[PDB]
Amino acid sequence: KNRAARVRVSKGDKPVTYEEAHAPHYIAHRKGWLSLHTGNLDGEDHAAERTVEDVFLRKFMWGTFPGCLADQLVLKRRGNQLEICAVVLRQLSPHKYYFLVGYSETLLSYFYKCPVRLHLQTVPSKVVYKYL
Amino acid sequence: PVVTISDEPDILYKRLSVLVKGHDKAVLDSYEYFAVLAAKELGISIKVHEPPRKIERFTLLQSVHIYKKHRVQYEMRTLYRCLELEHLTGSTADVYLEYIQRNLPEGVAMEVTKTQLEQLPE
Amino acid sequence: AYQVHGLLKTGDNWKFIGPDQHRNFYYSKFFDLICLMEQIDVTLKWYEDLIPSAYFPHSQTMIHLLQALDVANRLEVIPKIWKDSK
Amino acid sequence: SEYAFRMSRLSARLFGEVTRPTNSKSMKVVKLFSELPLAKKKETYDWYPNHHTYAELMQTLRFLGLYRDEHQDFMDEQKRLKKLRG
Amino acid sequence: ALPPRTEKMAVDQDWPSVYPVAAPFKPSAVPLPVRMGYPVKKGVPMAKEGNLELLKIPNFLHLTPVAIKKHCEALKDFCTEWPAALDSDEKCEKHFPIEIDSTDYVSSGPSVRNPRARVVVLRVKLSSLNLDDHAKKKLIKLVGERYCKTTDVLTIKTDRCPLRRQNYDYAVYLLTVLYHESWNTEEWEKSK
Amino acid sequence: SLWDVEFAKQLATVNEQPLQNGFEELIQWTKEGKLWEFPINNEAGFDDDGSEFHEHIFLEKHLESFPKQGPIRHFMELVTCGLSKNPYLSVKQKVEHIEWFRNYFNEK
Amino acid sequence: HYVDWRMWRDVKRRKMAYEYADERLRINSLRKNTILPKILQDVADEEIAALPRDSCPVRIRNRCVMTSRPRGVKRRWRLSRIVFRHLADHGQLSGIQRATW
Amino acid sequence: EVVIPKKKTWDKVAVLQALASTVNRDTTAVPYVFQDDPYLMPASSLESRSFLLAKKSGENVAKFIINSYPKYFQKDIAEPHIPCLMPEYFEPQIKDISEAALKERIELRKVKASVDMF
Ligand SMILES: [Mg+2]
Known about the structure:
Oligomer: part of a larger assembly
Protein name (chain H): Small ribosomal subunit protein mS39
Structural class of chain C: mainly alpha
Largest sheet of chain G: 2 strands, antiparallel
Family (chain H): Belongs to the mitochondrion-specific ribosomal protein mS39 family.
Subcellular location (chain H): Mitochondrion
Number of strands of chain C: 0
Organism (chain H): Homo sapiens (Human)
Strand order of the largest sheet of chain G: 1-2
Strand content of chain C: under 5%
PPR repeats (chain H): 94-118
Shape of chain C: globular
Bound molecules: magnesium ion
């Protein structure tokens, strides 16, 4: 059986989000992409280092906003304006939130050498598309 | 509104054609509307064209150790939309081209622009 | 007061507000005065134009924001400004 | 003929390729210097992310407490519970 | 939390002012209950306040037709007009002879080095040369792979020097010294 | 000296105001240089000391003529045309390539 | 701090190939050209065969930028089959669909 | 006759300044420095000042980390070189007793170090 990105059915008590619920055959039929970088089009050079930096961003922001990122991020990349739009929860204090925003806001700018911008989007509870 | 009219006669751009490569036709034709209405109120003559999509399909194995008969196949949809500007001015260039360039979409956006500037022989 | 608010709106002179405390004092005093001698419709127009876009009202203003409404006998606006204050 | 040969010679002198008639086994020289060698390419020498700035900055930022990695938390905890007995 | 600016916002409020720049959705800012996502069997498409699908959409919120119109009021400052060089291609060919291809390949990310952006090719017409009789034969035999016969266009390509402006210089220099060597009569033209 | 540059710093402090808009974010970003120059010329910076077309491909000024009928001088034609058709290397690395062969050719 | 020793072994291979590319390039052309005497090359041969065996561009194995797996790598993203499958199946690599032609 | 016009030359900001003139201020929105999420909007002037000083804390906090470890950020990727984005060196690199070292320590504004080595 195919076991790639398919959360199996439990007993009907398993909260799950649109992203996790959809399987890889819906990857742009129903889901779309979580990272919008241009390198995977027909003619371009640097797609490999874009992905190497992509997995880095996913894991840095995962370990730097500890246990508050509701679902996964949207690493869009237009011009030299990398963007880390988020869906972060409403549990930690806003001064801590603004702090980790600033810390990231400048640290990825000095790691990747371009404008990096985080536009958080606070949400009360981790969303549920269906209970599996 | 700093303008600074400086010195030398124009560069006379003929046929600044923008070829827009993308992963998503809905972003490409929204872009077509944004550029077509901008050229309408810019005064610059635009035309539309659809350079046909190329699919980069390729095959990998599905299981980690064995079973070469069971394979996965992945594909890239690269679509093109050509937006060819004809009979436009050098000043007209780095203001329209600039507006669009800054207001480009994300990973589904490329703006390959060829310029045919005219000139006198020497 | 309107004259130098105009001098402020000339060009980039808004920059010469400077820091946030000076901005809050500037707009607080401007809104106090608008409440003290303007007509209630243009006071509420300045209220929606300035708050919360330009500054955050100080505790005292709240009281004053009301005295103008009480003078104009426009007590129907009390629940919305109460909700805004909360 | 001779005119075709020396007309190609004139065109070669004009455009900048090798003038006198040479064979392919030597024209490999101009093709060489015309391209970069296998090791000098940008992708060839930048194949791997160096892994040191990456992992050592993660080390230092975790030791500053600004990064929580669940993996190192595991190995920390498991190595403690293994040093309890081993 | 807070009751959002969406139901604080009313009609006839300026949307170019609300969204200045391209930015991801921000549904609290957006006064549209836009719903996205394959629905459940006995349910609706998912709501607006938390969707990642409504985030991953490029989002052309910043540029609405009226924003285009008001944007270019200012963007109208920066343009002259063309002369009466006429839409007639033969007229612009008479007026300005040569043609040059000098392009950019814009990418998206940390750098702007696309080396293939130095391609410079030059197309010229001999019927716009006008000073070529038997010296034309010279030019043709000299350029071997160019001059397709159906249309009288010469195309010289330079990709040999790293910069686009000196590539333009190489097109014009090769054109003029090809021209001068074509008008240079040589001692073996008769023994053909 | 330090007094006029310090007056420049303090003038910057007394005219530093909040960004207040996403366009002014890009204003400051260009003003510093983190944002790209738009529209882009794919060759921003990247001057190469004004190579200008005759140092890159005509290496005769650095050729240092030996007796031209020799196979060595043939080599120099071959290597010269290779360095002419090089667009990735600049003129300075072309001339150190020439002097490598010059040094070694003499060394023998 | 490298994924394995073999990856670290290539990062060393990459480095000293990239630094030792000019010297090798010069003597090698001198090899496959037909101008210098048959004996005038025997000497250049020594220099090459004597130039160290970790910079020859014959030992470069395009391995995995994330998890050292030699065979089964796709060059365009420098990823192995199963890692590229993982990322493209979780949906963080743009443009990659499932081929249904 | 060709009325071939002279190109008016612009700077790199004037288009975007005209674009601000296009987008006058939003009377209904908070300043752009704050986020648009209703949980993250400041409610009071004190809260707004607290958020801004927390953001400025995060800023000199990243500056301290990056200047403490410049080796992890020496790899430049953007072209052109952005010297306001490369890390700043505060340690004196000249250890010999010289007037160049005096100029280096004065430029680094190390008062005690400059006095001691003078
Ligand atoms: Mg199967």
